[PDB]
Amino acid sequence: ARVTVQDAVEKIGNRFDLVLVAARRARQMQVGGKDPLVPEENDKTTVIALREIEEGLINNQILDVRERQEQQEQEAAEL
Amino acid sequence: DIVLNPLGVPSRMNIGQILETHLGMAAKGIGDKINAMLKQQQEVAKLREFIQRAYDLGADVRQKVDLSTFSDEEVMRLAENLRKGMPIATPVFDGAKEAEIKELLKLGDLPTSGQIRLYDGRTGEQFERPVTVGYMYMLKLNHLVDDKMHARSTGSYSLVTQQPLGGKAQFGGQRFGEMEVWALEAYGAAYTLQEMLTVKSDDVNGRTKMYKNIVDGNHQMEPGMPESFNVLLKEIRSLGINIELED
Amino acid sequence: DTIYTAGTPSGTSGDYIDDELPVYQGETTQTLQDYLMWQVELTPFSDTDRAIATSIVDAVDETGYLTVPLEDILESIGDEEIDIDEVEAVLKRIQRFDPVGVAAKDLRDCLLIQLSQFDKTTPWLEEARLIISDHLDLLANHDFRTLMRVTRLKEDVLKEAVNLIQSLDPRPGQSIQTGEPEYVIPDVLVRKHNGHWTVELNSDSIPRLQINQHYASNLQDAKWLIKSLESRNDTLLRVSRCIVEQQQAFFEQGEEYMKPMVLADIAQAVEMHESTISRVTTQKYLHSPRGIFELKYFFSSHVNTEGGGEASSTAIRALVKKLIAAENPAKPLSDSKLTSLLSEQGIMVARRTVAKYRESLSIPPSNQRKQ
Amino acid sequence: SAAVKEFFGSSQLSQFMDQNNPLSEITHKRRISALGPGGLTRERAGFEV
Amino acid sequence: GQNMRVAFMPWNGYNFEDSILVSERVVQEDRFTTIHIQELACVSRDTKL
Amino acid sequence: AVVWDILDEVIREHPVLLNRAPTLHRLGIQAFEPVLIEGKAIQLHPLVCAAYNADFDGDQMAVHVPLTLEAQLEARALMMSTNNILSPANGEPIIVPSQDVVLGLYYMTRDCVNAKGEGMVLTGPKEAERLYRSGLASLHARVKVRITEYEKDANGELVAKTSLKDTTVGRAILWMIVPKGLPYSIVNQALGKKAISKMLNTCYRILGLKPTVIFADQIMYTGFAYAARSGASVGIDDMVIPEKKHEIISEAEAEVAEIQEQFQSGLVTAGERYNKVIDIWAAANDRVSKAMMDNLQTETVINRDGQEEKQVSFNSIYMMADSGARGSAAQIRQLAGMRGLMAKPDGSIIETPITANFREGLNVLQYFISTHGARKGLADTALKTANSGYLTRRLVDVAQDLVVTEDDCGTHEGIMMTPVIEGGDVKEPLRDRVLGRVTAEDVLKPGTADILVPRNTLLHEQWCDLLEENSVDAVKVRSVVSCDTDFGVCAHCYGRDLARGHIINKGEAIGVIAAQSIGEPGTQLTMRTFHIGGAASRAAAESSIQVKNKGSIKLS
Amino acid sequence: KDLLKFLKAQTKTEEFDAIKIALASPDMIRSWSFGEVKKPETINYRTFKPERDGLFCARIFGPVKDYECLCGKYKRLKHRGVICEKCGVEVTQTKVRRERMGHIELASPTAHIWFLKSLPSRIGLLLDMPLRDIERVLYFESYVVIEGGMTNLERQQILTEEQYLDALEEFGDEFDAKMGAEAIQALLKSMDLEQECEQLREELNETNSETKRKKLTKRIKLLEAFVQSGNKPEWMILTVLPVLPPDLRPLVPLDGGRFATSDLNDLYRRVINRNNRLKRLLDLAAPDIIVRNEKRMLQEAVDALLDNGRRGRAITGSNKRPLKSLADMIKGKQGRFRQNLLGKRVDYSGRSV
Amino acid sequence: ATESFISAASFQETTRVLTEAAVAGKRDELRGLKENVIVGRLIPAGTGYAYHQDRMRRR
DNA sequence: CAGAAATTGGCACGAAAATTGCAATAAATACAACGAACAAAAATGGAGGTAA
DNA sequence: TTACCTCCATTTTTGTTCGTTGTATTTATTGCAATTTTCGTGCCAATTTCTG
């Protein structure tokens, strides 16, 4: 994804939604201390998100499911 | 010394430069001959004979040069001055024809067409076609890159509108006019435009929070309201007209 | 009416492009407090720490010293759970910003703060630290002898420690100072020719406005302003000329030759209300070959003269200065001896007045001037 | 004196001389400008002039 | 200016779109080296203090 | 010494925006990845200058830095230079080689009669390169090479085929750059600018974006290298003056004289004589230009068997004009033909023409006459650019609100698209007008009532080919002028996104795009008017109709 | 009263979703102002401090230094929100000088040139009068009868000086005729909206034409627009004049510690001087022949302040250059909209060859 | 002749537009691109589209 | 290591001087500052012409 | 002779983007009555100084 973003756009299907999803994942990996799902090789948190999206490991539904599961875990720790 | 692009000659229609090049080469050639007559101590007779033959060349020129009125010291100093090339004068609308240039090239033992065979400096291989080589008079204009280069990350801002000053002497920022805004709208980059409008120019608290977050390795903005808009509201209110935000 | 035979050019073009210049807006500047707050923002504080830091940096003067005690700051916070030790911690953190030693309670604290940031390899650091920490008035009063007794150190080490002391910075906050100081343009000039002092208003400061009367009421009102300006500058010139005439001796022979004149003399000389004289001479200066002096500088009190008349307090101050300037270092002159010395030339001033004059001139007493 | 020095120092037709090379000075001295007091303007000139 | 030995031919795109390729011997001989002179002034004046 | 390592670390993948004023369209701001260099001048890729309208003679650029993560991802995903190959106003590529690259690719892909190494057989492009580098064969020799080409299968797969082609060494060498999926016919010809642009368009349409991005750089590198190797120069002997020039001029002069006397005869007024003189001189100038071009474009060479043959010339001026690298016909004609007619800044045409060229040299009167065109072309740039800046401001301010806000409004209305024929030649075929639009009604068979294209169908290249096969002459399509969406338009009523190829997305500000697309050419062509030098643009008014093909005549 | 909340509360953001524009009542203009401007002087030149009741007064617009009163009794953050009893200055941030407005009390009513001169004339269209007669009445050229009463005269009838004298000599005090902005204010105040709208609608429905149709349609639409919003016609004649915050109109600092007044300050001083002179003449009960020209000059000064050069000759300060007004500040290529809002200079930017 | 007065006063003839809108007591809903540029918000186009939709869902 | 004395500063005293609001001001013979006004296009009002 | 329509004159608005840029003279006073501020010097207490 260091040159083009065609594959990620094809996976997501829309160019304007891709930026939002990638920014969400990048901010998760930057200020949230989450581990990347692919082996990074001297990469920033934006190219890592784009390369994760290329593989089909990240999209809106997956992020929403992960957030809901983590909130359920927070509830379980709370009770 | 300098390599230029041929394609720039026909599209600009300034053919004269090419002509100058040819004539320039001719001039240099003459100098070389004279220089050769000085490295080896040729006597003054052959020197003055060749110089007179060079000066008499032309098709009914208006200049008569007679070297028999010159003492040998004067002839030698003239040859010393001419050893680097004989200067040539061509009036604006009474210049030198192509035939005279070709004759002068013949006198200096150079190809008449004005093109020689060059070789590649990296591979030693001859270029496939003859190339035009000559001497041209180059100038250095007063636009030095030492003056143009400029950059700024943060500096002083205007007192009323709280926007960065303008100019290299004021250590200012680059203007982002209406047309650049139109281009960014055409692209669809709303976040780039929003951070161009608030956190880089006018959001007084936005600038500080953005700087603090950048230092902390957290890239995120919390935009507010530009101060110029509040100035506009005050200026409209000073006209006796009530304008306000609501809800 | 002379021409300046040298000068400095102005960096600009003679002519500007015909479009009107934009309205003046201004330009922000960085003072000490702005820099300190910028460093505060980029520092990992809590919220209460940041509030205390804002309160502290608010109360830092131009030189970088903390003007208010910490009790004022803790009261200004307005909370009851916060103690004074938190304020101390925040202050200690702030004092290590750039420049090092800012927001210091007093000189001893500033010097110790600056000294704490050195390396142990420094030749004489502990000696300087001890001298600052315990015995400071000894170094200020130029004892150099009882200090040797208390420190139990020979000459060389003490001298080197003092050299280190005089290498620090006593005003760390003045590195970030103002850009360029202002300057005052004189109103009137006093030159000398024909053995007389000519008084003339500044030509470079007095232009004559173009009379706009062609569209013609408004013309009469405009001329009223002209007459008012005429009367104003005439009054200023008359007052200045009278003052210069009265104080001729001072302009020639300098100090010690003033006369004790008050507003009554000017009021009676120019036939005007003394309130007008007070109003006109306020915040106006005159340029003389001797310097630049405020127009109100020539008015002062007086003292009784034995033979008759009065002596200007300025003359008494100058005489005291010139008497002190030529005293013996071994036994500096005292106040009573100074009064006795001056009471031979008809000068009759009390010891209290001499003390007041000495304090005004900022000269230490006799015991601190002994060599 | 005021009028003369004003004309010689702060007029529209009084400019700093160009001093890149002799040609600049020669060209600047031999110049004819239609602007200035009593002349045209960049906005009221027209197109035939 | 200066007389330069010039050839007209494309050279690997370093004279693309009106760019100019210059030899290093031109720099080694200070042919286009200029001198620039600047003036700075300091004025000490009188103050009320 | 460590802040430099830190700086190299912090800008590894962090785009910056480059901008050059005036920003006439959305391609005036583009995002790139930085490479740290020593110096004080920015270095720009040669393939983007045409988009920026930038040349290296003193131009300056501004650089901005995105800060937030969203801004960086927008710069990489929207504004990056690899996402702007197709123009949003045409759909044609704008990352297109020009000048040196085009000249090199044109020089290497040509043929010569009886060159060195003509008539030999090669086992592939690699043997062609090995022969050329060792000097055993020339770049223009005509050889027979075994070539393998790959054709895409119906299911999206490659099938290979191998055959003996008759080609040249240069085309064989160039063949190693073309990616797999394209036919060999694209490179088996002399390559101008149109051919290169069409080849890039075909590459984008067949393969995708990334192969096109690699192909453009490969083309640029090869063109630079072989243009340097060519050593193509220009001399004063290249410009050739045709013999029949002055003869033509003489004839024209006589004609003017005749009508001049006719003006003194009282049979024609002043204006008619003015028009007649102008038309006569235009005809004479066109004749002189055509004669010069005919003389310049042929060379005589020796065949291998000893007899003479005639081929396309290798003159430098002819190559620089024919390849389309730089310079137009209107600029090459004045070098060896005649200057012609000039124009004053008010737009009128001067009666007296110039009958000299720049190789011969003007005299004082002709130069004084030609200064008027210089004044015109200089004053246009300085004054008549506001008339277009205001127009684009008004267009932007009227069309700003329009945004695609739906997917399908459901209308059946539309407009009828038919070819544009003006004169004997078709100005715009039906294929170009309907490319990328959505049909409003089922398109019928030309001779029967059978469905050829179902309604609400996007017309990509395959459908246009299908329409061209059966010779359809009119198709009804959907347009934004008839849309049922409130406060916006739908994606189907707008059609294809011209800068991407697929259908438009929701949230696209199409109004600003259209306003910029309309506004830009006016300003650009206004500022580009001094290149011709102030010459007059006039075609002699025809006085007759001349059909070109067999058929019936219809009057309306 | 807590420093944490106080520091947090001054950096909060205001949430909105729309912008509302309308006319301004005198009550609203008074509510905006933190004080009253009386004297024209800007800066005292004996202490270099802003003057009392001036264009820069600290008691009106705010402190000149952070957390300090003018005289200097209270000087630190512990005294925040405390008004010094002597100087009357609040102890707070200095930046409040950017967001505090003042007001000026006009001795006589004045018309707003925008609602008189921008075609179509709103005052004229509402009163159904030609702009020429309104301009005659406002600038002291003719008389207008407010109420006819039992006399032959009718409302909105233009009379000259001799005609007014003859009417007085014939009838007496049975009718009211006036001039200046007071007459226009009274005419606007005495009219009705709903009755006029109904009568005009009936007249339009009855008669048939095209010119009269369009004119009546425009008039009834203006009346309906006035009725729908909360505005009232009499507000178009200004009574209280707002004053912009000082920090948005700073003095030009020259060399030597002195300042020069800018264009807005000049116009403010001019209108203040005219108002003070007119008030003094009104107190003295001077002959009316003089107060007429004084009121006309005050009207001209206010018009020049609001929009310089729109009517009559443009006022210039020096070098024959017109003074910028508020309208020139708002509009044009150099105004706020096209110079600081639709395009602005930014940080983190550079340029080079 | 657009609905909003900000997007018209920014364009041309500020005096007339402001006077007419003030007399009419108009209201601006900040719907187009220019009005959102003026107050420094996300334009309702492209990357800033979805957000705006969410806003209209809260209303 | 010490208490008696010089020495200096805080407080105080009358009394003389510097500072502030608060009503009250001119004022004549005389032209002379300018500039010299762009090109289109739209709108509105007034004088003239017309259907009836 | 009635109202209705039309053409001529006056007014108002606008006229590309960067980069470079560039102004100054100082501006009301003026007389009181009351007010507040400040001057020279005395007086006593608390340091420094003194030899013994």
Ligand SMILES: Nc1ncnc2c1ncn2[C@@H]1O[C@H](COP(=O)(O)OP(=O)(O)OP(=O)(O)O)[C@@H](O)[C@H]1O
């Ligand atoms: N008044 C102007 N407004 C806007 N852009 C301008 C203006 N004047 C010049 N330009 C810009 O300058 C460019 C001209 O480029 P440049 O000066 O490098 O020469 P050129 O037209 O490329 O020709 P050549 O280099 O062959 O002489 C125009 O394309 C335009 O973008």
Ligand SMILES: Nc1ncnc2c1ncn2[C@@H]1O[C@H](COP(=O)(O)OP(=O)(O)O)[C@@H](O)[C@H]1O
């Ligand atoms: N008015 C202008 N606005 C924008 N760009 C310009 C303008 N004038 C020139 N340029 C561009 O800037 C480059 C440098 O211009 P510059 O050298 O200042 O002009 P010149 O060569 O006429 O002296 C030119 O190549 C030109 O394309």
Ligand SMILES: [Mg+2]
């Ligand atoms: Mg250029």
Ligand SMILES: [Zn+2]
């Ligand atoms: Zn639709």
Ligand SMILES: [Zn+2]
């Ligand atoms: Zn106070």
